[PDB]
């Protein structure tokens, strides 16, 4: 059945990490390239998507007086960007320059939009290919578990001890060879139930 | 810690 | 206001070209903008001479920037035809550099021109 293939999950989780890396590099480029026009923004607004949206609404600092950033930013932050716009140390840019920077920012929000779509799609795949696992550990940790082993079957043939320390091999074998205590959480540390526990109960 | 350890089962 | 600044008067130009000829005979002269640039990087330049009639003047405007960063005196002379002739070579020279040497035979003469160039700047 098309709805019970695990090769989609292993690729989706790999794709999702690839998107996060590429979306981050473009965000830095926009913060650097647009930072020439107005370098104080990066310190005020840290979110890459929110940073990109400000450029789309107002391409130039002069526009900051009239442009409204309410839908992007809270009240106290949106006024900080307005004050900084006038007293900025940056240089003016041509409309030819502005056209390509807006194009880059559009790619930020479009990539951010698709990243949210892929996150939902991975949840849908996980709730159909391994519904029982998702009910217990969750979609994100569940998908990470499956991808680490390489297949759903390869994970099924593993004892629960390995599933406990599945993502901590660097620490595990270092400890085993050096007569030291071994890790006790691995990749399951980010499961919701583990977080609810406290102290030594996390290990249990 | 090379002085502390000793090598065995040399191959 | 003009890019080539300060420009030495007629009297100072002859005094500068006198020192250039002596340094040429004593192997204390670097001819050409490329060789002049290296001396500034090594900090072995006593001062720089440039030609104000260079065509275009912009191909030697990196030198004043390097000098002012390094606190090295520099001056412009009106003619590259005259500068190259006094340098001892058969071609025009747009820039020349007097190499630092406190054991030179022309040390007093070099410092005399250097003092006047600082006054010019």
């Amino acid at each position: 059945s098309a709805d019970k293939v695990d090769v989609m999950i292993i690729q989706a989780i790999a794709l999702l990490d690839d998107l996060d890396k590429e979306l981050n590099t473009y965000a830095m480029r926009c913060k650097e390239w647009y930072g020439w026009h107005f370098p104080e923004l990066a310190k005020i607004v840290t979110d890459s998507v929110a940073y990109a949206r400000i450029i789309l609404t107002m391409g130039i600092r002069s526009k900051a007086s009239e442009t409204d950033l309410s839908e992007i930013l809270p009240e106290e932050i949106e006024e900080r960007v307005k004050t900084a716009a006038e007293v900025s140390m940056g240089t003016e840019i041509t409309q030819t320059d502005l056209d390509n920077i807006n194009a880059l920012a559009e790619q930020i929000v479009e990539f951010a939009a698709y990243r949210e779509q892929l996150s939902n799609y991975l949840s849908a795949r996980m709730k159909a290919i391994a519904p029982n696992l998702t009910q217990l550990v969750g979609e994100l940790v569940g998908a990470r578990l499956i991808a680490h082993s390489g297949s759903l079957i390869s994970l099924a043939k593993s004892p629960a001890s390995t599933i406990q320390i599945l993502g901590a091999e660097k620490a595990l074998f270092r400890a085993l060879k050096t007569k030291h205590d071994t890790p006790k959480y691995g990749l399951l540390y980010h499961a919701s139930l583990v977080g609810q526990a406290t102290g030594k109960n996390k290990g249990k | 810690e090379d002085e502390d350890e000793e090598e065995v089962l040399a191959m | 206001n003009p890019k080539a600044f300060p420009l030495a008067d007629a009297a100072l130009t002859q005094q500068i070209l006198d020192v250039v000829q002596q340094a040429a005979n004593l192997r204390q002269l670097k001819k050409g903008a490329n060789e002049a640039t290296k001396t500034l990087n090594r900090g072995i330049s006593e001062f720089i001479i440039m030609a104000a009639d260079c065509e275009p003047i912009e191909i030697l405007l990196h030198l004043p920037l390097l000098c002012e960063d390094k606190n090295v005196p520099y001056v412009f002379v009106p003619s590259r035809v005259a500068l190259g002739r006094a340098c001892g070579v058969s071609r025009p020279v747009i820039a020349a550099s007097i190499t630092t040497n406190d054991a030179s035979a022309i040390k007093t003469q070099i410092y005399a021109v250097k003092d006047k160039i600082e006054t010019l700047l």
Binding site: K179 | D2, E5, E6, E7, V8 | -
Partner: protein
């Protein structure tokens, strides 16, 4: 403690002992001369 080591780690361990003996020899020789003076 007894351990089992790979070839590269043995070479790394062999090298560091060679260095330490040379340093000890160079230091002691340096000491003896200054003591003599």
């Amino acid at each position: 403690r007894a351990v089992v080591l790979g070839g590269d780690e043995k070479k790394a361990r062999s090298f560091i002992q060679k260095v330490l003996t040379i340093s000890k020899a160079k230091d002691s020789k340096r000491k003896e001369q200054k003591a003599s003076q």
